[PDB]
Write an enzyme that holds these catalytic residues in place. Sequence first.
Site, mmCIF file in Angstrom:
data_model
loop_
_atom_site.group_PDB
_atom_site.id
_atom_site.type_symbol
_atom_site.label_atom_id
_atom_site.label_comp_id
_atom_site.label_asym_id
_atom_site.label_seq_id
_atom_site.Cartn_x
_atom_site.Cartn_y
_atom_site.Cartn_z
ATOM 1 N N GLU A 162 67.922 -29.609 1.528
ATOM 2 C CA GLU A 162 68.638 -28.499 0.864
ATOM 3 C C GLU A 162 69.738 -27.761 1.671
ATOM 4 O OE1 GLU A 162 67.171 -29.121 -2.767
ATOM 5 O OE2 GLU A 162 67.461 -26.939 -2.652
ATOM 6 N N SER A 407 8.604 -8.884 -17.519
ATOM 7 C CA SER A 407 7.773 -8.941 -16.323
ATOM 8 C C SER A 407 8.502 -8.362 -15.115
ATOM 9 C CB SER A 407 7.342 -10.382 -16.037
ATOM 10 O OG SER A 407 6.171 -10.717 -16.759
HETATM 11 C C1 LIG Z 1 6.073 -11.744 -17.726
HETATM 12 O O1 LIG Z 1 7.195 -11.704 -18.231
HETATM 13 N N1 LIG Z 1 5.181 -11.368 -18.665
HETATM 14 C C2 LIG Z 1 3.791 -11.461 -18.300
HETATM 15 C C3 LIG Z 1 3.185 -12.532 -18.970
HETATM 16 N N2 LIG Z 1 3.433 -13.777 -18.241
HETATM 17 O O2 LIG Z 1 4.820 -14.136 -17.814
HETATM 18 S S1 LIG Z 1 5.221 -14.609 -16.436
HETATM 19 O O3 LIG Z 1 5.535 -16.075 -16.330
HETATM 20 O O4 LIG Z 1 6.451 -13.942 -16.049
HETATM 21 O O5 LIG Z 1 4.090 -14.207 -15.574
HETATM 22 C C4 LIG Z 1 3.576 -12.619 -20.463
HETATM 23 C C5 LIG Z 1 4.393 -11.521 -21.078
HETATM 24 C C6 LIG Z 1 5.469 -11.002 -20.180
HETATM 25 C C7 LIG Z 1 5.836 -9.677 -20.739
HETATM 26 O O6 LIG Z 1 5.593 -8.587 -20.259
HETATM 27 N N3 LIG Z 1 6.537 -9.789 -21.886
HETATM 28 O O7 LIG Z 1 7.024 -8.497 -22.938
HETATM 29 C C8 LIG Z 1 8.352 -8.126 -22.893
HETATM 30 C C9 LIG Z 1 8.992 -8.565 -24.075
HETATM 31 C C10 LIG Z 1 9.986 -7.578 -24.452
HETATM 32 N N4 LIG Z 1 9.420 -6.302 -24.067
HETATM 33 C C11 LIG Z 1 8.540 -6.617 -22.985
#
Ligand SMILES: *C(=O)N1C[C@H](NOS(=O)(=O)O)CC[C@H]1C(=O)NO[C@H]1CCNC1
Length: 697
Positions: A162, A407
Site C-alpha cells: 500500500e 430441596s
Molecule cells: C428435594 O428436592 N426434595 C426432597 C425429596 N427428595 O429430592 S432430592 O433428590 O433432592 O433429595 C423430594 C421432594 C423435594 C421437595 O422438597 N420438593 O417440593 C418443592 C416443590 C415446589 N415447592 C417445594
Amino acid sequence: LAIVFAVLIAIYGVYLDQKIRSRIDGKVWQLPAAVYGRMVNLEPDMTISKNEMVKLLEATQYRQVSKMTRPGEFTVQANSIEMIRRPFDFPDSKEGQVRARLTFDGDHLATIVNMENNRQFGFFRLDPRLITMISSPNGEQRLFVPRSGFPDLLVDTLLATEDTLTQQLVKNLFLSSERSYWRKANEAYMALIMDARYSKDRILELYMNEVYLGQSGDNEIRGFPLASLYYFGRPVEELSLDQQALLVGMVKGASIYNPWRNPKLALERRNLVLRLLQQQQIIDQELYDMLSARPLGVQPRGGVISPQPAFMQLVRQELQAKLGDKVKDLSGVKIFTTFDSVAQDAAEKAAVEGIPALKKQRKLSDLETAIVVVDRFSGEVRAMVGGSEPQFAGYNRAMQARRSIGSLAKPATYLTALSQPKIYRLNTWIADAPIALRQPNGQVWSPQNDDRRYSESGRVMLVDALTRSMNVPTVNLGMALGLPAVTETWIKLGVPKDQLHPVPAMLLGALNLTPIEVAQAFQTIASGGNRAPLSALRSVIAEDGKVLYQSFPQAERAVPAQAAYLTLWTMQQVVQRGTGRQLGAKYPNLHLAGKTGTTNNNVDTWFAGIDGSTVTITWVGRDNNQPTKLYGASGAMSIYQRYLANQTPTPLNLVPPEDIADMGVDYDGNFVCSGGMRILPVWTSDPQSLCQQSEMQ
Ligand SMILES: *C(=O)N1C[C@H](NOS(=O)(=O)O)CC[C@H]1C(=O)NO[C@H]1CCNC1
C-alpha cells in the site's frame, strides 16, 4: 494576475492545520472499554497439574508448538512446560515477553524459571484473556496499540502492498467516502500537512488503528490490532504471515474480502498479497508456495458479535452500581473481571452436550439449563451459563430465571439448628412420624416424605435427615426452631430479603431464587460461614493508568464456623451416601460437599456442589415451567458431573475449625467415651459431653 486565488487556498491551508491540531493532539477516538478475565498467578508448590496448565494456557490464547519462536506459544515436555508469557500491561506492573519453564512434580507446580537467568519466580503473572469489548454510542470498535507493538515485519507487508498511506489515512478519520473529486483534493492537501506536522513513525500508529477490517452487527471493526483477535484470536504482534496477509489484503476490501462470507474471494485475495511481496526481496519462492498452501484463515467458525453474553450482563450491571453512568464518557478504559475461561469452557460445554443428552435420553421438546460458578471464599464469579445454547443468546437464566429451589432449601434449616451446639447436634434425634398443620384457612398441611414412608423407629438422627433429604423431619426440625430463625439464616447467607415468605413450606422450598442468588447462599456456607458478596469485577483502570475503581474483600461472618463445618460435612454425606450418592461414586476423592434439589412435578432440578475451590450451582428445567420428566435432582447433577469431567476440580479437604471434635455415638445415638459404631464431628471445646451422656446408666 489574478494570483489572488493562491492567497485563499493557503489561508485555507492553515485552517485545516488548526483543525488537525484539535483532532490529533489528544483525543483521536472515543475508545470503548476493554473487558479482561481473571489475572492468574502461578507459584511454587501451587496446586496445579501439567495437563491442567496446558488447558489453562490454551484457554488464554497460547498455542502449543514443537519448538517455540514468538510470544503466546508453549511447548510441553514429560514433566515441564516452556512458554513465552506475552507482554501485557498489568495494573500492578507493565511487563514484557518472558520465557519461562514451568516444572511439575505431581499435582503441584514445583518451580517456575526464567530462561535468561535461570532464576526462580516467587510468583509469575499470567495475562488475562481479552473477553470482549463494550461498544461506543458512535459504534466503532478499535484497540489502541503503540506503533512499536506492531512487528516491523507487518509494517513491511503493509508498505509492500500500500505505499499512498498518509493519503488513505486522512479520508477515514477526516472526510466522507467517495462524495467528490472536491474531497480528494482536500485529501492530497491535508495529506502533506499531516506528513509535514506528524512524523512517519506516528502516521502508521494512527493508520493501523483506523483501517476498517471486519464487521460485528452494527459496530464496525476497525484497527489491525482488534482484527487479529476478531478473526484469529491472537494479538497482531503474534500474527503469522498468512494471517497478516489476510489483514493487509483486507484493508481495501472489508466485506467482500470477509472470510466467513466468501472463502474463494478471501483466499484469492490473500494469495495475491502473498505474491505482492515475491517481486519484493522479502519472499523466496520456497516460502510463497508454502504460505499460500497454508490455509490462512482460522475459522472458529463464528461471527462473535456478543461474546459471553450472560456473564457480561452481570459485569455491565456491576459497572453501573459501582461507577454510575460516567464510565461511557471515558476513553481507553480497561476493565478486569473475575471471569475464568477454563471454568467457562467447562460450563458451556457441560450445558451444550448435557442438555441434548437429557432431552434425547428422556425424549423432550425443550430443556434449558443454568450454571453459576463462584469462588468458595471470595465470592468472585468465575463462570456463568444462561442457557443450553450459551454462545448466542438474549435471555440469561443464571440471572433472570427465578425458580423455586425446593430441596436447595434444606440446609438453611439444619445450619440454623446446628448453630445451637447445646441443643442440636448431628446425632440429635428428629421425629419421623405423620405431620398435620392447620393454617388460617382453609387446609391442613400434611407433608409427606419422598417415599411416602416413615422411619420404623419413629425417628432419625439429624445427620441422616438432611443426608437423605427427608421432608417430614425437616419440617419437624424447622417448626421447632421457628420460621423467623430459619428466615434469619436465609438473610445472613445473603438471599434477597423480599423473597422470603416465612411460612412452613419455605422449610421445603417455597422460595424462589435465581441461580446466582442460590450461588450466594451456598457460598456463605462453603466458606465456613463468611458471606462474601459476589462480583464479576476485580478493578476498572483508566487509559492514563489511573484507578477509577478497585474491589476489596468485603466478606462478613454470617454463621458460626463450627455450624457451617458441621453442615458442610453433612453435605459430604449427601454426595457420598445420600441424595447425590451418584456423583460421590464417580468422584470419591473429591469428597465434594453438595445438595440436590427437586421441585414438585419435577419442574425444577438443582444441584449445588462445593469442591475445595468453587461452589457450582447447576439448575435444569423448562422455561415454560412444565414438568421435566427428570426423576430426581440427577437431571442437573448429570450436568454438574459433566462440568467436573471437563475441568480439573479441586478435592474438598475441610479443615475442621476450633472446637470441633470427632466423637463416638452408639446405635441408640448417645455419645460414648470409647468405641461406638458411628463417629460424628461435634462442636465442643470440651468433649465430656460424653461422660454426661454415659451417666444415663
Ligand atoms: C428435594 O428436592 N426434595 C426432597 C425429596 N427428595 O429430592 S432430592 O433428590 O433432592 O433429595 C423430594 C421432594 C423435594 C421437595 O422438597 N420438593 O417440593 C418443592 C416443590 C415446589 N415447592 C417445594
